Amino acid sequence: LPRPIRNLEVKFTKIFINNEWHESKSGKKFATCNPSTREQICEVEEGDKPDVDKAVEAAQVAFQRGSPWRRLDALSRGRLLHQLADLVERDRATLAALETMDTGKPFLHAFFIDLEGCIRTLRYFAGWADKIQGKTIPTDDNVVCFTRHEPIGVCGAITPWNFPLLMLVWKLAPALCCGNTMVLKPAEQTPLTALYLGSLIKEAGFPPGVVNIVPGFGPTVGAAISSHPQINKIAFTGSTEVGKLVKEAASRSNLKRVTLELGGKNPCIVCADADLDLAVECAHQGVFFNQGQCCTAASRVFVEEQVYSEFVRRSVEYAKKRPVGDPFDVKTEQGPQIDQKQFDKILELIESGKKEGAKLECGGSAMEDKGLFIKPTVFSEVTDNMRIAKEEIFGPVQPILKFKSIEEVIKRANSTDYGLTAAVFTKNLDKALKLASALESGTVWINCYNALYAQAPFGGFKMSGNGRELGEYALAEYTEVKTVTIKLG
Amino acid sequence: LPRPIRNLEVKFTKIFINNEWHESKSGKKFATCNPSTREQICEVEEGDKPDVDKAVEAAQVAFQRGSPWRRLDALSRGRLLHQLADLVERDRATLAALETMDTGKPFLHAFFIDLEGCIRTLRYFAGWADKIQGKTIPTDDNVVCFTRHEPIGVCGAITPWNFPLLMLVWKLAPALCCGNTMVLKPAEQTPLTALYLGSLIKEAGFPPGVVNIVPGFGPTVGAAISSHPQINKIAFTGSTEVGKLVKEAASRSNLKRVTLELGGKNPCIVCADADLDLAVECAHQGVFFNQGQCCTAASRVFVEEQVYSEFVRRSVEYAKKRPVGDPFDVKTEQGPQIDQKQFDKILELIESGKKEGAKLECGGSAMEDKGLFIKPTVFSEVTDNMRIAKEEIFGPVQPILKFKSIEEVIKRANSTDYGLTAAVFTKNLDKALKLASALESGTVWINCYNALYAQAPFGGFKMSGNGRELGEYALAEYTEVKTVTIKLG
Amino acid sequence: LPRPIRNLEVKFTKIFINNEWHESKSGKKFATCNPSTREQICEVEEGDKPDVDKAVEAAQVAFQRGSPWRRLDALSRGRLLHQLADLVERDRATLAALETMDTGKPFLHAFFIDLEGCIRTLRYFAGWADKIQGKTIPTDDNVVCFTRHEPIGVCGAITPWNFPLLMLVWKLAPALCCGNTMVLKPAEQTPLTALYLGSLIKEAGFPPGVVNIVPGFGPTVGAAISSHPQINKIAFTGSTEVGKLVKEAASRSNLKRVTLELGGKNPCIVCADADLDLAVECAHQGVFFNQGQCCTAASRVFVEEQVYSEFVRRSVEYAKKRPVGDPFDVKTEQGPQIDQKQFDKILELIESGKKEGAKLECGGSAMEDKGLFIKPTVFSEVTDNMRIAKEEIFGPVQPILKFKSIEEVIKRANSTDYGLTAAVFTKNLDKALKLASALESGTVWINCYNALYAQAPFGGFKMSGNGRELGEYALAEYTEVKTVTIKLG
Amino acid sequence: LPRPIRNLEVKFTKIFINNEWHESKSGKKFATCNPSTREQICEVEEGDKPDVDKAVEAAQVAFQRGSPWRRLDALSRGRLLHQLADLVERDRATLAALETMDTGKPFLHAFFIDLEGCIRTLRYFAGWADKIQGKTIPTDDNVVCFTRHEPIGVCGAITPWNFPLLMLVWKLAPALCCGNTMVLKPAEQTPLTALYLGSLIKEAGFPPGVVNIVPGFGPTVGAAISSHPQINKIAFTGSTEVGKLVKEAASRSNLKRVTLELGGKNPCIVCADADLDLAVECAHQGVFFNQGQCCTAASRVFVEEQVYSEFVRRSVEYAKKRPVGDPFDVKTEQGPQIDQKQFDKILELIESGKKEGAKLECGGSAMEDKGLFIKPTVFSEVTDNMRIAKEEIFGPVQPILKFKSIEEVIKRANSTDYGLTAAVFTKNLDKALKLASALESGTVWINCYNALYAQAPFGGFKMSGNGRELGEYALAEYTEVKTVTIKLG
Numbered sequence A, B, C, D: 001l002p003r004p005i006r007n008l009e010v011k012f013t014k015i016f017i018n019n020e021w022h023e024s025k026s027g028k029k030f031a032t033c034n035p036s037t038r039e040q041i042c043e044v045e046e047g048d049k050p051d052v053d054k055a056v057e058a059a060q061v062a063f064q065r066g067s068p069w070r071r072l073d074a075l076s077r078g079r080l081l082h083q084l085a086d087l088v089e090r091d092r093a094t095l096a097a098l099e100t101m102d103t104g105k106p107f108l109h110a111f112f113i114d115l116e117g118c119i120r121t122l123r124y125f126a127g128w129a130d131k132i133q134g135k136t137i138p139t140d141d142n143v144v145c146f147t148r149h150e151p152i153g154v155c156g157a158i159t160p161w162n163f164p165l166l167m168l169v170w171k172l173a174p175a176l177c178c179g180n181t182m183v184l185k186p187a188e189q190t191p192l193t194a195l196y197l198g199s200l201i202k203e204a205g206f207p208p209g210v211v212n213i214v215p216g217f218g219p220t221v222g223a224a225i226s227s228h229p230q231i232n233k234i235a236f237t238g239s240t241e242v243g244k245l246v247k248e249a250a251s252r253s254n255l256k257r258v259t260l261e262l263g264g265k266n267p268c269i270v271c272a273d274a275d276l277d278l279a280v281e282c283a284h285q286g287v288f289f290n291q292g293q294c295c296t297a298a299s300r301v302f303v304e305e306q307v308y309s310e311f312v313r314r315s316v317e318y319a320k321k322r323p324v325g326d327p328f329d330v331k332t333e334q335g336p337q338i339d340q341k342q343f344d345k346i347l348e349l350i351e352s353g354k355k356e357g358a359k360l361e362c363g364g365s366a367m368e369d370k371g372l373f374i375k376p377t378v379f380s381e382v383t384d385n386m387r388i389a390k391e392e393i394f395g396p397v398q399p400i401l402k403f404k405s406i407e408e409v410i411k412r413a414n415s416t417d418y419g420l421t422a423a424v425f426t427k428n429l430d431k432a433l434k435l436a437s438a439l440e441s442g443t444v445w446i447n448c449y450n451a452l453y454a455q456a457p458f459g460g461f462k463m464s465g466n467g468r469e470l471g472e473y474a475l476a477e478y479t480e481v482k483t484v485t486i487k488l489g
Helices: A049-063 A073-092 A092-103 A107-127 A162-178 A193-204 A218-227 A242-253 A274-292 A309-323 A339-353 A406-413 A429-438 B049-063 B074-090 B090-103 B107-126 B164-177 B192-204 B218-227 B241-255 B276-292 B305-320 B339-356 B406-413 B429-438 C049-063 C074-090 C092-103 C105-126 C164-177 C192-204 C218-227 C242-251 C276-292 C308-321 C340-354 C406-413 C430-437 D049-063 D072-091 D091-101 D107-126 D164-177 D192-204 D218-225 D240-253 D276-292 D306-321 D340-356 D407-414 D429-438
Strands: A013-015 A021-022 A029-033 A038-045 A133-135 A142-153 A154-158 A181-185 A211-213 A233-237 A257-261 A266-270 A298-304 A358-363 A377-380 A398-404 A419-423 A443-446 A477-486 B015-017 B018-020 B029-033 B039-045 B133-139 B143-151 B154-160 B183-184 B211-214 B233-237 B256-263 B265-268 B299-303 B359-362 B377-380 B397-403 B421-425 B443-446 B478-486 C015-017 C020-022 C028-034 C040-044 C134-137 C143-151 C152-158 C180-187 C211-213 C234-237 C255-262 C265-271 C300-305 C359-362 C377-380 C398-403 C423-427 C444-448 C479-489 D015-017 D020-022 D029-035 D040-045 D134-137 D145-151 D154-158 D181-184 D212-214 D233-237 D257-260 D267-270 D298-304 D357-360 D375-380 D399-403 D421-425 D442-444 D478-487
Touching: A013 A029, A013 A049, A013 A073, A013 A193, A013 B339, A021 D192, A038 A193, A038 B305, A049 A154, A049 A181, A049 A218, A073 A107, A073 A193, A073 D107, A092 A162, A107 A162, A107 D072, A133 A266, A133 C015, A133 C143, A142 C134, A154 A162, A154 A218, A162 A181, A162 A193, A162 A233, A181 A218, A193 D298, A211 A406, A218 B406, A218 D429, A233 A242, A242 B241, A266 A274, A266 A406, A274 A298, A274 A309, A274 A419, A274 B339, A298 A309, A298 B241, A298 C276, A309 A358, A309 A398, A339 A398, A339 C134, A398 A406, A398 B233, A406 A429, A406 C423, A419 A429, A419 C020, A429 A443, A429 C430, B015 B049, B018 C180, B039 B192, B049 B183, B049 B211, B074 B090, B074 B107, B074 B164, B074 B192, B074 C105, B090 B107, B090 B164, B090 B192, B107 C074, B133 B183, B143 D134, B154 B164, B154 B218, B164 B183, B164 B192, B164 B233, B164 D181, B183 B218, B192 B211, B218 B241, B218 D478, B233 B241, B241 B256, B265 B276, B265 B406, B276 B299, B276 B305, B276 B397, B276 B421, B299 B305, B299 B406, B305 B377, B305 B397, B339 B359, B339 B377, B339 B397, B377 C242, B397 B406, B406 B429, B421 B429, B429 B443, B443 C134, C015 C049, C015 C192, C040 C192, C049 C152, C049 C180, C049 C211, C049 C218, C074 C105, C074 C164, C074 C192, C092 C105, C092 C164, C092 C192, C105 C164, C143 D298, C152 C218, C164 C180, C164 C192, C164 C234, C180 C218, C192 C265, C218 C242, C242 C255, C242 D015, C242 D240, C265 C276, C265 C406, C276 C300, C276 C398, C276 C423, C300 C308, C300 C406, C300 C479, C308 C359, C308 C377, C308 C398, C340 C398, C359 D429, C377 D091, C398 C406, C398 D107, C406 C430, C423 D421, D015 D091, D040 D192, D049 D154, D049 D181, D049 D212, D072 D107, D072 D164, D072 D192, D091 D107, D091 D164, D091 D192, D107 D164, D154 D164, D154 D218, D164 D192, D164 D233, D181 D218, D192 D212, D218 D276, D233 D240, D267 D276, D267 D407, D276 D298, D276 D306, D276 D399, D276 D421, D306 D375, D306 D399, D340 D357, D340 D375, D399 D407, D407 D429, D421 D429, D429 D442
Parallel strands: A154 A181, A154 A233, A181 A211, A233 A257, A266 A298, A266 A419, A298 A398, A377 A398, A419 A443, A443 B478, A477 B443, B154 B183, B154 B233, B183 B211, B233 B256, B265 B299, B265 B421, B299 B397, B377 B397, B421 B443, C152 C180, C152 C234, C180 C211, C234 C255, C265 C300, C265 C423, C300 C398, C377 C398, C423 C444, C444 D478, C479 D442, D154 D181, D154 D233, D181 D212, D233 D257, D267 D298, D267 D421, D298 D399, D375 D399, D421 D442
Antiparallel strands: A013 A021, A013 A211, A029 A038, A133 A142, A133 C134, A142 A477, A358 A377, B015 B018, B015 B211, B029 B039, B133 B143, B133 D134, B143 B478, B359 B377, C015 C020, C015 C211, C028 C040, C134 C143, C143 C479, C359 C377, D015 D020, D015 D212, D029 D040, D134 D145, D145 D478, D357 D375
């Protein structure tokens, strides 16, 4: 375990364009606060449309034919991405501390989970750079026909506050491996790790203008990126409602391509033949990981009647033993919620569950009347039409529902507008495969939870998103297909 | 050569749902009129929102787990598509005669071009049904990870008036081969071939609800398909303006996936070392084919200064010998235009050319007041800022521009918001390949024009579209990726 | 069920070259006998090296550049293969009767299994013809690099006596879909279905010389094909010992590519948590199908101790109820063995099992002292070092062995030089996947047996073969990779 | 430019097994001598059958299930290969000096050509380790079918004397990236770089037994690897005659898979429209690079009659200015030949040219009696039936043949039993593509020669080899396909 850097001085708080640090055009700044100490960390430069316009023009010049970045051979782009992963591993403790200060997640979780995900994602996509291949297509005796997988051009990345550096790297790694240029917008709540990564990008040797970063707000920077007529592609992670606004702005303007990684109403199904202890620990971590602030969070834990009561009992014991406190402390498993708006919203849904009919098995209130901490809550006797079972909580609350048959639980799990992830716990080959096939979800985990790999694609069915991130499938979002058809005389 | 059908009577004019013919729920009907004889062929049922709701419900029931369509093995869906291709070959003359009566295009063009493409596309995708493969991904020693390429669900298709049946087949062939269900809306101007196809779909053996057809108007039937909360995917062929409305409505409702095939400002590049007779004849067919009413139409012909005057001279001669007239008449190379609007805008573009400084070389006015036909027009001394070189003409007007260097023509060719097709004419290996890689177009033809194959993908860069039709790439538009991760004890 | 054609007159008994029927150069003929009636069916022309030489020269001329077959577009080759599958389906009853007369397999098994396999294999590979694609490879800014998947050229096919038409089609379908020419040698024991297929090949429209067939013996025709300096590839199905001779002759001569589908010592593992009735019926059909004359035949049935005794009892009941008789009779499940050499060899191994220590549970002798029929035999108490558990029987004998643990049964199943197929029967997800991974076998079936698909590759690990048949993997055996690298100046 | 090492002492001369250095079991040793100074560098341990048996056993234990190598995750094998590439870059000067002392090739050629290829190949295949994906195949509603691309097992590698370390890396990089274990045998003439690599393999962290190195002779160590019953795959680079012995021995023992990279009779085709200075300089490097001792050497230079005399004139001038001499000397373009045999056969081929009717234009004899060097020779008026145009020279002799038509030169170029590489020089798009598709060669270079990439496959058609090295195609040689079919109840 590394030593927690309790007091770190922030060095990077400016707009990053053409490998230079700039003040905002207006002079405006915004504060970034620590959700644990409830104190301001620093002020970051606040961008607007004029700053986005300078960042898009920087990215266009870097992408123009004959530019140093365009004439670089495929293996050199991979080398640059490996050089960046080395720099991320060198400054791993500085980066994880910035993530903890901005988000409130435990320092050890950001070090061993978020930063490991970033390094792995960068190394996997560095290896694809010289392996992006098109096809040679058989047609007629006198025709030569082939496809090229060309870069799209300028890519915009809009990232969320829960996993700020990870969600940025998920977009940056395949975009740069494909030979594109970028304009990044970190979340208004969490800009520090993105700005740190900027210095490492300059240090790794990327030509100026290949990566540009403009901190600021959704209605200003976000809207300017979504509607820009010179951005060819946008990747967005966040809520379904904001995702819809991004896609509409993209259509209305220049029909730029749009990847969306949105929310879900994720089911977690526990069969009567499951290894109950495994199912209890996995459903527990699936709900409470990152203070329940995960897109993959189990929002509906369906448990077969034969094991329901024991499942509830063993889950309650886990929830009471979960250490909540200072994220810079080695024993901490749960930090504070991101902000007052999220904290009050979780408590509003917890109160709703009480007056709807659920059985509060433990938790149900704040830890102390001073911080943003919520005690791990477990609700039993939860039904399909209750608010705690219908709405995305984004907090530490485990709603446990009951089911009798597989055909029934399939219908109940698929009755949502969402389809991000699903998890199934059973020892029976036929049940597991029937459920893997019939669940309308982008990822189905069997006898595990949150099992993510740089090489396995991730994304949603229905209103949980469009397109995929990770794996070879992420390259299709960052390339344009060109068919060359030559007729011989 | 086949004989055209004299008094072919239309038999299918109703709404097609669950393999049955229905009258519109409002009782309303609309007229389909022969553009050549200017007389009404018949009255087709006019659908609206409640007919679309009835078709989507029928498609959802056909897509349910355990339905005859879903439980069919992969090779049987291919067998059905081969059975449909056989019926389209048997009734080839009936379908081509319906297409001539609706669009006014020459009978031999619809028989040997449109119907040939329909048959080749159906046969090509019939072969993909048992070859849609996902991946097995290596991760860790104790994990089994894989992807499934599942059907998306209910697909809506919205097609244009210029190639009614072919544009319909381009969407229907990969959708059915991937195991989806469909709700089709033919253009209001040309609904007869789509309705005839419905009878063939029933005869071929497709289960009820797999293909549903709802004739009607854009603001009514089209809008209802775009906004439908139970349609998972939509494919649209038409204009950039209508494509933007379709994509905006899709994002506003349920984030359904959208493929778009739109227009372009397609350049032709003729180098000094081209086979000048090949380039003249290909650029001629590129500008004047189907009365210039084709998404692949060349709207800018760039010619190197060394061959400029001779290219203009031979193009003027070639355009004068072109036979325009009666569609059913064997000798006809160009039937009539589609409508009054755009006909006026073409003559207004022609007048704009004369006033902006271009040299009218031939044509430049209407033919003979008993049908909307334009005389093949050729403009020389054309420059980039002129209207005839900036707007999408959609008529028989050939603007010939001059260029000196390859670097200059690449920049002028790509100075557009569009990028559907491009054509290069040169006998030089390095020039051909430098232009193929530098042109920002979905398709680059070398020493040919309109060379399309069911096996080569087709689609636009920038504002010319999203996604691809044809080839193995069409399958990505009709499938959803599911990752299944299994952790072993 | 079709009507069994009890008395059929054979029409095709000659050498097929350039779509013409020829007598052998020497004048020699060989007899083909019915293993049921023990009477001669007819005399077939007997080829030698001079006949093979004329067949290879016919195949070379058909393959030369500019030949009708080489200039045919990809989709036309697929069309030809579909035309052949239609002709095979038309003459399905004639073909299945010829297979029964030559092999002794039940007419219903040849109609519904062998002939269905042929038709399916032909239709699947007809669909690959226009989908054989190479790659476009990213290298340097100034280099264009791509691969072509070219046909190999003249292909030799040497087929066995157990599934004569099926094993021929497994080789012919991908070879012709890839654009190759062929020289076929059916087994000396079973030439009639191959010669029938020749007439259908001429009838389907294949140019002369694309498929050539030379009946005869292994040391004459087989050796001439293996060593021919103008044959580029050979595919062989048969014994490991003859497979080794084929591969050596291929190396010694011109280094032609060689696919080998050889024998196996196939394990069939039955766990204590298996659905015992399913495991009993699958192991039964796996052993006794085609009179035990299958390359996929279970030679070692390992059963966990908890269910051993019941497994033995239920298996014995199946073996006693199995109908043995005239293959042209609707109730027959088991015909005669192929010949006297095979029949005496099976009885020699059955006697060996008696004097080695096995418990003869049923069967053990011929049905009548007049025919080639052997009564279904089941041996219990079989151990690893017994002859009935070590050697390939190729007859109706079920050796049932016992195991205690999974780690033990993995070591015992993998202790062979072979690795064709394996089958596992369990309801536990982890056991099934651990066994699928750790068994060194080309195909692992879980809760099924003999589940073959045109789209799933088949072949052996270790001494069970080289290369694969079926699926997309079969195309790699029938194409040569060419890299084209172009440097731009 | 780097400085050559003056008195570099060799440190690694023993047998490498289980990450340890061993003396040969017989105690025997053999001498490695510098071909330039003609003095003994050192005495390397001489292995035989019992040392090969000890290396195969160590490789089998490293390949067992549960071994540290097998249980490593896919990304960690790539990490190890990147670690090895870093050590090869660090010790680049030591490795290139060892290669110069063993082969006599110029120090700057081994530093910037051989060592560069080794580093690029290792880095390329390090990126494939987590991207080797099998397929999920669609079959029936109730079946789950998939393929796994598993490692083959123990791989033997047998390399030549001309590019010792590079040919070793071409086999080692994909074998280790696929998870195999290896037994290597460097050429008897050049074993020092292979032994040095072994120390780097231990330093990099590869578990013991993963790579084992056994120096020795062909008839002893090579024969034992070819016939070993526990080696699953062998890769061989060398002559067609030795390759046939290796493949015959492999088939005779256990049917181990064999990749072969052999010689060729590589043509150069120069069209009348070529850039004549480019073609002269490329055909010169193609004939005289590495003293003509390269598998890619041009052995037939076909020139169109229109440029024939001028091509011969400029080639004669170019060959006269070529600097031959001391390898460590910066100015040297061509060091000495390898051995006494072949040196005599080259002068005998040269004399055969004069007597058969060819015109000796320059060179044609030895240089200066104190080393085996030949003066760059050029023959004009060469015809197909002549010895200088039929035999593989393997020396600095340029035979220039004349041609009139493209159809004629295609036939003359392909009238060989070989087909490794071909090179075409033309500025014409149609000629370049017609020749690329009609030449029967594994690689067709256009307007370049020796343009190799770790990402483009390389190998021969006909008797030039079996299988491919480099690119994604190399992975098929180092994996075995397993189909897993699961039928659901």
